[PDB]
Design a protein around this ligand. Sequence first.
Ligand SMILES: Nc1ncnc2c1ncn2[C@@H]1O[C@H](COP(=O)(O)OP(=O)(O)OP(=O)(O)O)[C@@H](O)[C@H]1O
Ligand SMILES: [Mg+2]
Length: 316
Amino acid sequence: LNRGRSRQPLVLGDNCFADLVHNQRVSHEQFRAALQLVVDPGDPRSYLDNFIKIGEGSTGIVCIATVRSSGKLVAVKKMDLRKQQRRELLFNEVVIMRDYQHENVVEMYNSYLVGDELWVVMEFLEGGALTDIVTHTRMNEEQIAAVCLAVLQALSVLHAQGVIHRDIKSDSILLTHDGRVKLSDFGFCAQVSKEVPRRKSLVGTPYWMAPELISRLPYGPEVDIWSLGIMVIEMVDGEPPYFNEPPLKAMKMIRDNLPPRLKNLHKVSPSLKGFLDRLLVRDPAQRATAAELLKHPFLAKAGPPASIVPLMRQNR
Ligand SMILES: Nc1ncnc2c1ncn2[C@@H]1O[C@H](COP(=O)(O)OP(=O)(O)OP(=O)(O)O)[C@@H](O)[C@H]1O
Ligand SMILES: [Mg+2]
């Protein structure tokens, strides 16, 4: 893989291929039949015009499209059954977004099976991803606080039912045109419960991976919180720590070193500094819960939606 500056997730888990990294007919038909039962029946192509590809992903492509009867725009994510890194994770794309209506979760309208593709029709977030903004601009604390608040509200809800997102980074936060903020990328979730306390699968984007996850130890909803820390580093410093190193070299460093600090603490409020110390804590048991964090003084800094508007490409 290694070049560095790589944004693309990495998906394995709980086996030998996952150790290696310390330095079909029957199954398909069964899996397809199962999905078929889980999704909404029908074919969206019967009600949707104008499919144009607008985005590429680890698990598939995204197109915009037109509700024929209404003119309304929708986004459609299309995922191949044969082209998945861990086929079973596709259940997430259907189940999660459905089970979690919330002001900070992207809305899902419907899901269908089309050929050997899973298709999810979801609301179109006209604002774009956070990543764009972070890589081409400097958010002030008011705007940063507004972002974390939204993300944290969503995470509190997922973690309440022991759902781990496993892919928290700017590429996963989307925006409406009027400065509202939604979490978006539920492809790689896992769940914990009273009888499955932790998980051991190696899933995430290298630079954003919690260090206990890298150390192949059993993890929990805590990993998301470390990743959020890293996302804060993006919003401030523009890219994650060790971004320029190759993913594998970066991980090694994350496992071994002390939690990363911001480049320049001269201009950052102690309120924000203190916040981030609650996120990037190596020992998970010490690291803060989204529940707790929602009460942190820093988030009272959070500006309204209107204060996010100027950050978006249309207005730069
Ligand atoms: N509802 C939406 N509105 C606008 N843009 C979207 C929407 N959904 C996705 N996109 C854009 O298209 C891309 C689609 O990839 P997405 O992040 O949805 O999942 P993925 O990388 O395929 O897999 P995973 O969900 O497992 O991380 C994103 O990078 C995002 O910028
Ligand atoms: Mg994504």
